[PDB]
Each structure stands twice: as C-alpha cells, then as structure tokens.
C-alpha cells in the first residue's frame, strides 16, 4: 500500500504524503550561455603587415652591415 | 394514533408466563378451540384468509405469509412436502421466539398444524436453536401432551388430516437461522445456505417442497383465523398491519419485551411500556430498530420514526425482527458496531468469498477505527468494501454484516472523523 510505504508520523489523509526527489534547488539554477563567444582581439591586418615590412627592411640593412663587416 | 393494545386484543396472553403454559392453561386461554372446523374449512380458504389478513413475515424478510403459503404446489405429487418452523433465533437483540416457545407452546403447535393444513404439508419440523434447552423441554412436553390428547397425529382433530410434528435442535450457529442453511442443517450437513435457483417451495428439505415460516407468524396464524382477518388488519396501517412483539433492550431504564400494535412511534414505544432512556429522551444517541442486521438510526430520526416495515424502510433502515437496541450518549456506537461486526465475522459460515473474507476485513477495519488508527480515505474504503460485500454474496447474512457499518458511516461519520484526527494528533505528538 502506498500509504503504508510512505507513511508519515502525523498525517491523517492520504494526501500530503512525504516526497523528496531529484530536482532544481529553489531558484531554478542559472543560465548556461548556450551561444558562442569568440573574441577577435588579435593584431590588426595592417599592423602585422607594417611590422613584417619594417622587419624585412631593417633586417636587410643589418644583413648589409654584417656582409660589410665580414668582407 | 397507533399502539396502545388492550389485553383482549393482545395475542400472546401468557408472554411473561404468569399462568400455566401447558394444555390445561392453553384450553383455559382459548387454544385448540375449533381446530377441527378450521382444518375442515379448507386449504384454499386458509390461504385466502392469510392473504387478506395482511400478515407479513415476522422473521425479518417481511414477505406476505399468505402468498408465501400459496407458493406451495396444489397438486400432491409423489414428494410429501414439509413445513419447517424457524425457532432458531440468533440475531442479537431479539428473544421473542424464546418467550413464545417457553410460555405458549400449544399456540405454536396449533399454528404448525394450521400452516401444514393450509400448505398441504405432510409433516412439520420445528428447528429450535441448540441454546434453548429449557424451551426445548417445554415444547417437548407440550408436543407429548398434544399427541396424548389427540390434537396431533393420524387424526389431528375430528378432521381426517394426517399431520406429524417433530422438533429438531441446532448446535449454536447463527447462519442456521437462514431458510436454506436451516434445511441443510436439518439434513444433517453443515449449516451452509444454498443458492436460490431452486426455491424451497420446489426443492427444499429433502428435495421435497417445503416452506420455512417464522415462529411468530405460524403462532399468530390460528388466532387471526379464529378472530377474523379484518380484526388483524384493523391494527397497524396500510400493508404492514397486525400485532408485533418488540424487545426493547439496551440503555433503557427497564428493558422488556411487549406485544404492541404495528406502526407505533418508536419514542412512544420506548417511553410508555419500557420506561424510557436511562437519562431521558435527550440522552438517547442511537437506536437499532430491528436486530443487528438493519442499520441504526440517530436520535433525530427516532423522534418521529414509526416502528413498522414501511416507515423504517422509508428511512434507510429496516424493521427486521423489530427488537430495538438503544444506546445513550454514555456508550460508544463505534465500539458497539465493531462488536457487531465481530459477531458477524464469527457467525459467517464461510462458503462464499465476499462474506468469508469481507466480514473479517470489516471487523479488522472497525477495530482499527475504534481507537482511531485509520484515515479519511480508509473510511471511504470501508464504505466501498461494504458495497462490495453487500450484493455479491450467497445469502442475506452478507447484507446483515454490511448494513450496520454502512449505517454508522452514513450517520456517525463526524465521530469517526474526530477519532481519526485525535489519533493523528496523538501520533504526531508522540
Ligand atoms: C443472517 C440470517 C439470519 C436469520 N435469522 C433468522 C431468525 O432469527 N429467525 C427466523 O425465523 N429466520 C431467520 N432468518 C431467515 C429469514 O428470516 C427467513 O425469511 C425466514 O426463515 C422465513 O420468513 P418468514 O418471516 O416469512 O417466516 C435469517 C436469515 C439470515 C440470512
Ligand atoms: S453471505 Fe456467504 S459467507 Fe455469509 S453466511 Fe451467507 S453463504 Fe455464508
């Protein structure tokens, strides 16, 4: 019998029987961010191109100086 | 309006046994007066007089005695046919047949003769309950006196009717009061009632056509025949008419058995001949109007209810054996009905499932609810179990066990509510 299995010390009616199952805590959990957030905070395209070009120019100048010293 | 019988209109003039109950007393009081003429008059004449006298079965069923007698076969077949007289009263509260057999046995014997003549019965068997042994001895002595005087035997009277009356005693069983169970017990088997495709008027005591009739009806048969059916129909009202002896017992001041006109108010019956409730009318709580079979009634209904077949049936109850058991405010009606359920569980024969098991279940539930160890849905389940037991059982003892619980649920439900709530509070506190 359901009442026999779920008997309460001081209950009178079959209703308000004790119950405790897995479920949300009071408040219903928290949002979980189903969407995606990909930030693009890397260097700009013009910045890296200018860096590469300046690096190439200064490196060729250094190559010239080193070749002069070796000569 | 109804009631207040005079000593001349009372049928059982030796109810308390203040005079000689034997043959000499019987002749002095007016027994065996014109039995020869009554037998000579005719079986059909006797049946017609019973039919137009308004007499109804006094064993509880209330079926018309005249029609019940006319149900017998008119043409004498090979089978001898039988009369049986139900002296086996075991329903709680009623003791009228005890007094009838003990103090007016010659009236019972003359009634057996008259009923056998009117139903073309070869022989009669009086089934006394095993508990009644002094009454059985008195009836044996009366039967021997009648046989010696020639009132019974090959020549019952100047008429040529052949009639033999024997008495057989039970061994303490309440189911044996039922007609088919009584026939089975008289056959020498267990007191287990039969079903009802074969009616007892077709295949009864030994397979022969027999008729089972109550002691009170069979005993009042000669008196109403001698005094006229109109005289009997004068008392009472409508269909249910005549003189019925009520046993008033319980918490009344002076419990007593008294013969009174039919359709007397219950209050008037209690507070005129018996004496009244122990602490006045206001002290009265609940009255069971018939035996323990019929449902009880609260104080409110008993103020104006009439002690007869119809008014007690107009309310959800029945007259039954018309033995009122009163209960005042001092007692607990829940415990009273629990004891009644225990009695029915004890006295069920246990051949058919709804009564063999259901009566025990009802007793256990009533015992639980007496203390209060139950639930609201459990009293609802108790009512449902009552309904399940009632209509699906072999005999009327299932109804007799179901009815008191149903009446208690119908009327005294708040008492059960209070008991259950109090026990729940006590359990929570503990
Ligand atoms: C549980 C139960 C108890 C009975 N008790 C009695 C009883 O005490 N006396 C009796 O005459 N019949 C008793 N009977 C049988 C019926 O009252 C039956 O109708 C009766 O024997 C014949 O009806 P009558 O009143 O027309 O004579 C009982 C039946 C049952 C089912
Ligand atoms: S109702 Fe069934 S169990 Fe009850 S006494 Fe009758 S036959 Fe037996």
Please outline what is shown here.
This is part of a larger assembly, with chains A (about 70 residues) and B (about 425 residues). Chain A is an all-alpha fold and about 70 residues long.
Describe the structure using short key phrases.
part of a larger assembly; 2 chains; A: mainly alpha; 2 helices; 0% strand; rod-shaped; B: 430 residues; five-stranded mixed sheet; 11 strands; NADH dehydrogenase [ubiquinone] 1 alpha subcomplex subunit 13 (chain A)
Provide a descriptive summary of the structure in words.
- This is part of a larger assembly, with chains A (71 residues) and B (430 residues).
- Chain A has 71 residues and is mostly helical.
- In chain A, 42% of the residues lie in helices and 0% in strands.
- Chain A binds chain B through residues 3, 9-14, and chain B through 375-377, 420-421, 424-425, 427-429.
- The structure holds flavin mononucleotide (FMN) and iron/sulfur cluster.
- Residues 175, 193, 348-352, 355-356, 393-395, 397-398 of chain B line the site of iron/sulfur cluster.
- Chain A: Complex I functions in the transfer of electrons from NADH to the respiratory chain. Accessory subunit of the mitochondrial membrane respiratory chain NADH dehydrogenase (Complex I), that is believed not to be involved in catalysis.
- Chain A: It comes from Vigna radiata var. radiata.
- Chain A: The chain crosses the membrane at residues 42-61.
- Chain A: This is NADH dehydrogenase [ubiquinone] 1 alpha subcomplex subunit 13.
């Amino acid at each position: 019998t359901e009442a026999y299995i779920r008997n309460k010390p001081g209950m009178v009616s079959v209703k308000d029987m004790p119950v405790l199952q897995d479920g949300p805590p009071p408040g219903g959990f928290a949002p979980v961010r189903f969407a995606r957030r990909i930030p693009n905070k890397g260097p700009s395209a013009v910045a890296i191109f200018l860096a590469a070009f300046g690096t190439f120019s200064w490196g060729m100048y250094q190559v010239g100086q080193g070749n002069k010293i070796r000569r | 309006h109804f009631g207040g019988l005079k000593d001349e209109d009372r049928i059982f003039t030796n109810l308390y046994g203040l005079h000689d109950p034997f043959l000499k007393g019987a002749m002095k009081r007016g027994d065996w007066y014109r039995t020869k003429d009554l037998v000579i008059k005719g079986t059909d004449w006797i049946v017609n007089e019973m039919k137009k006298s308004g007499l109804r079965g006094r064993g509880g069923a209330g079926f018309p005695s005249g029609l019940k007698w006319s149900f017998m076969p008119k043409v004498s077949d090979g089978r001898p046919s039988y009369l049986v007289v139900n002296a086996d009263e075991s329903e709680p509260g009623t003791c009228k047949d005890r007094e009838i057999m003990r103090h007016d046995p010659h009236k019972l014997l003359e009634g057996c003769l008259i009923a056998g003549v009117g139903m073309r019965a070869t022989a009669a068997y009086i089934y006394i309950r095993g508990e009644y042994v002094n009454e059985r001895k008195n009836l044996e002595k009366a039967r021997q006196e009648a046989y010696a005087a020639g009132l019974l035997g090959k020549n019952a009277c100047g008429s040529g009717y052949d009639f033999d009356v024997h008495i057989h005693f039970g061994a303490g069983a309440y189911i044996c009061g039922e007609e088919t169970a009584l026939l089975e017990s008289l056959e020498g088997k267990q007191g287990k009632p039969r079903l009802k495709p074969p009616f007892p008027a077709n295949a009864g005591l030994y397979g022969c056509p027999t008729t089972v009739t109550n002691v009170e009806t069979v005993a009042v048969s000669p008196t109403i025949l001698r005094r006229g059916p109109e005289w009997f129909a004068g008392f009472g009202r409508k269909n249910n008419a005549g003189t019925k002896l009520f046993c008033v017992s319980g918490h009344v001041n002076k419990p007593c058995t008294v013969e009174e006109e039919m359709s007397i108010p219950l209050k008037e019956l209690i507070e005129r001949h018996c004496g009244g409730v122990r602490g006045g009318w206001d002290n009265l709580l609940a009255v069971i109007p018939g035996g323990s079979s019929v449902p009880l009634l609260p104080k409110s209904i008993c103020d104006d209810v009439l002690m007869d077949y119809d008014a007690l049936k107009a309310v959800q109850s029945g007259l039954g054996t018309a033995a009122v058991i009163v209960m005042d405010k001092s007692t607990d009606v829940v415990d009273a009905i629990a004891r009644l359920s225990y009695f029915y569980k004890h006295e069920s024969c246990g051949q058919c499932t709804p009564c063999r098991e259901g009566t025990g279940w009802l007793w256990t539930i009533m015992e639980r609810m007496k203390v209060g160890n139950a639930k609201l849905e459990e009293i609802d389940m108790l009512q449902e179990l009552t309904k399940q037991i009632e209509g699906h059982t072999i005999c009327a003892l299932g109804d007799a066990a179901a009815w008191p619980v149903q009446g208690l649920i119908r009327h005294f439900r708040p008492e059960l509510e209070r008991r259950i709530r109090e026990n729940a509070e006590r359990e929570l506190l503990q």
